[PDB]
């Protein structure tokens, strides 16, 4: 009983949908830079970027389906600080920090958003998103397997990158709140599903329960 036609919904949608398009666009780029920095896995590293471009096109289609023009300007600025950190990190061969930003933080944020979105999405959008989500399950998380295979060498930079970057996702959660509520996506649910995905991700890489509690609390304990 959400009105996908009303002006509130389309308005909030212009920004939310833009965020996802932009996030996919930057994932595409990011996974290309990662293809350079790790030329060795560039094959698998190139397949993911392409996959996100597909996903990006899908969400664009979700936009026209609702006859909504996505505010791509607002979306660019939503990702800017994290995009800056990724760029700077990338410049300096800091591949661990790049993977944490893209493979862990960005992709946990998206998986959380997609699952909250589905049960309240319109028919077309729900289909695309179910597809996107399936694609994410049925492919290895590259950066996560890498970081895991390389944990001891990467542990310290990860903790640092987590301190530099986790708070920015926290800002993004607060910024996206109003509009997401309009779409029927509860803010509490998003924070919850994010932490669950991120915490599990940090476990898989090699962090202990105590380390995971410490690292997860870095955004919210400042708030
Ligand atoms: C039309 C999609 C609805 C879900 C919107 C989620 C609200 C904000 C989260 C955006 C996260 C974008 C990350 C994409 C990265 C891709 O790998």
Residue numbers in the entry: 9 to 231
Authors' own words:
Cyanobacterial aldehyde-deformylating oxygenase (cADO), which catalyzes the conversion of Cn fatty aldehyde to its corresponding Cn-1 alk(a/e)ne, is a key enzyme in that pathway. Cyanobacterial aldehyde-deformylating oxygenase (cADO) belongs to the superfamily of ferritin-like di-iron proteins and contains a di-iron center. SeADO belongs to the di-iron protein family, with conserved sequence of two EX28-29EX2H motifs, in which six conservative amino acids from four helices (Glu32 from helix H1, Glu115 from helix H4, Glu60 & His63 from helix H2, and Glu144 & His147 from helix H5) act as metal ligands.
Each asymmetric unit of WT0 crystal contains one SeADO molecule, and its active site appears to have lost both of its iron atoms. The WT0 structure is characterized by losing the di-iron cluster and by exhibiting a distorted conformation of helix H5. By contrast, the helix H5 is unwound in the middle in the structures of WT0 and molecule B of other three structures (WT1, F86YF87Y and WT-HP), forming two short helices (H5A and H5B) that are connected by a loop L5. The helix to loop transition results in a different conformation for a number of amino acids (from residue 144 to 150), thus the two iron-coordinating residues (Glu144 and His147) move away from the di-iron site. As a result, most of our SeADO structures with the L5 conformation lose their metal atoms. However, in the WT1 and WT0 structures, the electron density is consistent with a ligand with one single-head-group configuration, which is unlikely to be a fatty acid. We assume that if the loop conformation of helix H5, as revealed in the F86YF87Y structure, was not restored into a helical structure at the appropriate time, the solvent-accessible di-iron center may become unstable. Whereas the instability of the di-iron cluster further promotes the loop conformation, and thus results in a complete loss of the di-iron cluster, as shown in the WT0 structure.
